[PDB]
Short mmCIF file of C-alpha atoms and ligand atoms in Angstrom, two decimals:
data_model
loop_
_atom_site.label_atom_id
_atom_site.label_comp_id
_atom_site.label_asym_id
_atom_site.label_seq_id
_atom_site.Cartn_x
_atom_site.Cartn_y
_atom_site.Cartn_z
CA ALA A 1 -25.58 -135.19 -13.05
CA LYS A 2 -26.97 -138.10 -12.37
CA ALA A 3 -29.47 -137.52 -9.07
CA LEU A 4 -31.74 -140.43 -7.12
CA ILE A 5 -35.23 -139.24 -5.01
CA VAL A 6 -35.99 -141.19 -2.57
CA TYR A 7 -39.16 -140.68 -0.55
CA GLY A 8 -41.57 -141.84 2.36
CA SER A 9 -45.19 -140.67 1.64
CA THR A 10 -48.11 -142.38 3.81
CA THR A 11 -50.84 -139.75 2.28
CA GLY A 12 -49.51 -138.65 -1.12
CA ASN A 13 -47.76 -135.52 0.11
CA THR A 14 -44.50 -136.10 -0.11
CA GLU A 15 -44.68 -138.32 -2.82
CA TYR A 16 -46.26 -134.90 -4.86
CA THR A 17 -43.13 -132.93 -3.62
CA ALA A 18 -40.70 -135.55 -5.15
CA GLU A 19 -42.23 -136.13 -8.19
CA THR A 20 -42.57 -131.93 -8.57
CA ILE A 21 -38.54 -132.27 -7.92
CA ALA A 22 -38.07 -134.95 -10.18
CA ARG A 23 -39.66 -132.72 -12.87
CA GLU A 24 -37.70 -129.98 -12.31
CA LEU A 25 -34.83 -131.40 -11.96
CA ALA A 26 -35.16 -133.72 -15.20
CA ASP A 27 -36.49 -130.48 -17.47
CA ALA A 28 -32.49 -128.96 -16.06
CA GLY A 29 -31.53 -132.46 -17.63
CA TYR A 30 -30.65 -134.18 -14.72
CA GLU A 31 -30.80 -138.09 -14.68
CA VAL A 32 -33.44 -138.76 -12.06
CA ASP A 33 -34.42 -142.30 -10.49
CA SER A 34 -37.30 -141.57 -7.99
CA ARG A 35 -38.35 -144.44 -5.91
CA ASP A 36 -40.59 -145.05 -2.67
CA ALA A 37 -39.01 -145.97 0.50
CA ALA A 38 -41.61 -149.12 0.74
CA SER A 39 -39.38 -150.87 -2.13
CA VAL A 40 -35.34 -149.91 -1.62
CA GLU A 41 -32.28 -151.72 -0.84
CA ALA A 42 -30.65 -149.41 1.39
CA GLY A 43 -27.50 -151.01 1.05
CA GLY A 44 -24.81 -149.20 -1.44
CA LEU A 45 -28.20 -147.39 -2.48
CA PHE A 46 -26.65 -144.29 -3.21
CA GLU A 47 -24.08 -145.28 -5.04
CA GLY A 48 -23.47 -143.46 -8.61
CA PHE A 49 -25.26 -140.86 -7.63
CA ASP A 50 -24.14 -137.14 -7.64
CA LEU A 51 -27.06 -136.00 -5.71
CA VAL A 52 -29.33 -137.91 -3.54
CA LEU A 53 -32.40 -136.17 -2.27
CA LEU A 54 -34.09 -138.10 1.10
CA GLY A 55 -37.87 -137.06 1.63
CA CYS A 56 -39.75 -137.76 4.52
CA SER A 57 -43.51 -136.97 5.78
CA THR A 58 -43.48 -136.14 10.03
CA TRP A 59 -45.58 -138.61 11.95
CA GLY A 60 -46.37 -138.99 15.86
CA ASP A 61 -47.81 -135.71 17.17
CA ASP A 62 -46.23 -136.21 20.59
CA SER A 63 -43.12 -138.00 19.42
CA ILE A 64 -41.50 -137.28 16.39
CA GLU A 65 -42.02 -140.76 14.04
CA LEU A 66 -40.63 -140.95 10.35
CA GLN A 67 -43.21 -141.49 7.48
CA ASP A 68 -43.96 -145.82 8.29
CA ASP A 69 -42.12 -146.98 4.76
CA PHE A 70 -38.97 -144.60 5.03
CA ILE A 71 -37.88 -146.50 8.68
CA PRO A 72 -36.02 -149.55 7.72
CA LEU A 73 -33.88 -146.91 5.42
CA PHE A 74 -33.61 -144.29 7.75
CA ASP A 75 -32.36 -147.46 10.30
CA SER A 76 -30.14 -148.03 7.45
CA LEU A 77 -28.37 -145.11 6.59
CA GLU A 78 -24.69 -146.14 7.56
CA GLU A 79 -24.84 -148.51 4.54
CA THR A 80 -26.06 -146.21 1.74
CA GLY A 81 -22.38 -144.55 1.04
CA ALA A 82 -23.80 -141.16 2.32
CA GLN A 83 -20.09 -140.24 3.23
CA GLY A 84 -18.91 -137.40 0.81
CA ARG A 85 -22.27 -137.62 -1.14
CA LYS A 86 -24.08 -134.40 -1.79
CA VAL A 87 -27.44 -134.41 -0.47
CA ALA A 88 -30.79 -132.53 0.43
CA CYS A 89 -33.47 -133.10 2.55
CA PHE A 90 -37.58 -132.75 1.98
CA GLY A 91 -40.87 -133.29 3.73
CA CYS A 92 -44.19 -132.15 4.65
CA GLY A 93 -45.44 -131.67 7.83
CA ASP A 94 -48.34 -129.12 9.77
CA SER A 95 -46.43 -126.62 12.20
CA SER A 96 -49.22 -127.02 14.56
CA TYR A 97 -47.53 -130.43 16.00
CA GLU A 98 -44.92 -129.75 18.08
CA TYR A 99 -41.70 -131.04 16.09
CA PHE A 100 -42.54 -129.52 12.92
CA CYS A 101 -41.20 -131.23 10.35
CA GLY A 102 -39.35 -132.99 12.46
CA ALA A 103 -38.48 -136.55 10.53
CA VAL A 104 -36.44 -133.94 7.95
CA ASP A 105 -34.14 -132.20 11.06
CA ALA A 106 -33.81 -136.29 11.92
CA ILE A 107 -32.81 -137.31 8.48
CA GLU A 108 -30.55 -134.64 8.13
CA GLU A 109 -28.37 -134.56 11.14
CA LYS A 110 -28.15 -138.50 10.76
CA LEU A 111 -26.49 -137.59 7.13
CA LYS A 112 -24.21 -134.64 8.47
CA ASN A 113 -22.25 -137.22 10.80
CA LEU A 114 -22.50 -139.58 8.58
CA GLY A 115 -20.31 -137.05 6.37
CA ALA A 116 -23.00 -136.30 4.21
CA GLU A 117 -22.58 -132.87 2.04
CA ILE A 118 -25.54 -130.80 2.77
CA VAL A 119 -25.84 -128.74 -0.60
CA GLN A 120 -28.72 -126.95 1.12
CA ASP A 121 -31.23 -126.16 4.29
CA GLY A 122 -34.74 -128.42 4.36
CA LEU A 123 -37.11 -128.11 2.31
CA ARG A 124 -40.07 -127.80 5.29
CA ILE A 125 -43.53 -128.22 3.37
CA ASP A 126 -46.17 -127.06 6.14
CA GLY A 127 -49.52 -127.92 4.75
CA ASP A 128 -50.62 -129.18 0.97
CA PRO A 129 -47.63 -129.11 -1.49
CA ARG A 130 -49.53 -128.19 -3.72
CA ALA A 131 -50.50 -125.01 -1.84
CA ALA A 132 -46.16 -124.86 -1.92
CA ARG A 133 -45.31 -125.93 -4.98
CA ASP A 134 -43.39 -122.36 -5.94
CA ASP A 135 -41.60 -122.89 -3.19
CA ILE A 136 -40.86 -126.32 -4.71
CA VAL A 137 -39.09 -125.61 -7.49
CA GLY A 138 -37.45 -122.92 -6.11
CA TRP A 139 -35.80 -125.11 -3.85
CA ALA A 140 -34.91 -127.68 -6.78
CA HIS A 141 -33.48 -124.11 -7.95
CA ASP A 142 -31.46 -123.23 -5.45
CA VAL A 143 -29.96 -127.00 -4.62
CA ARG A 144 -28.84 -127.36 -8.68
CA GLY A 145 -27.22 -124.17 -7.75
CA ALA A 146 -25.35 -125.48 -4.66
CA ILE A 147 -23.77 -128.97 -6.08
C1 FMN B 1 -51.90 -138.00 13.25
C2 FMN B 1 -50.81 -137.24 12.37
C3 FMN B 1 -49.99 -136.73 13.52
C4 FMN B 1 -49.26 -136.15 12.95
N1 FMN B 1 -48.09 -135.47 13.18
C5 FMN B 1 -47.11 -134.26 12.89
C6 FMN B 1 -46.15 -134.00 13.32
O1 FMN B 1 -45.83 -134.54 14.63
N2 FMN B 1 -45.18 -133.14 12.81
C7 FMN B 1 -45.72 -132.40 11.51
O2 FMN B 1 -45.19 -131.27 11.21
N3 FMN B 1 -46.91 -132.96 11.13
C8 FMN B 1 -47.52 -133.80 10.92
N4 FMN B 1 -48.40 -134.24 10.89
C9 FMN B 1 -49.00 -134.06 9.35
C10 FMN B 1 -48.28 -134.84 8.03
O3 FMN B 1 -46.93 -134.57 8.12
C11 FMN B 1 -48.81 -134.03 6.85
O4 FMN B 1 -50.21 -134.67 6.85
C12 FMN B 1 -48.13 -134.49 5.71
O5 FMN B 1 -48.62 -134.01 4.32
C13 FMN B 1 -48.36 -136.14 5.41
O6 FMN B 1 -47.77 -136.06 4.31
P1 FMN B 1 -47.17 -137.08 3.33
O7 FMN B 1 -48.32 -138.04 2.61
O8 FMN B 1 -46.45 -137.35 2.56
O9 FMN B 1 -47.13 -138.90 4.18
C14 FMN B 1 -49.37 -135.58 11.02
C15 FMN B 1 -50.88 -135.34 10.64
C16 FMN B 1 -51.55 -136.61 10.91
C17 FMN B 1 -52.81 -136.30 10.57
#
């Protein structure tokens, strides 16, 4: 099985989350390609992957803003080959904001409308993902069981 993980992370929490997922997947035998959104090209990006996981923190406080490095990929998701693709999303946020993990919501809805197959509800991490490390592992399990 081939997995792509693409993360947008400003302070490293969604990156940590991505690394934790990647290790879970690889330990189970998946091929895993992990890329920072800051360096990816959207065109054809999901091509040849059995599973794509997109990670993005939420910013903006009074509005939903996606993690800065992830915006160009978001704005180009129609060119990624999401139709029929198995995908799931994750990201860090903080529930004291009005729009908790709103980036995850946004990405999920964009993927769905593109015809992607969302194989699991998004992983919405409240606070430090190091304090949610067992939720991360479990979600990576759930994703493997859902494909
Ligand atoms: C000024 C500021 C604004 C934020 N806005 C939100 C928000 O609107 N929604 C949310 O759920 N978290 C928000 N957060 C929390 C960040 O998502 C959180 O710090 C997260 O761990 C950053 O993950 P990253 O290091 O992967 O970028 C904000 C954080 C800061 C400091």
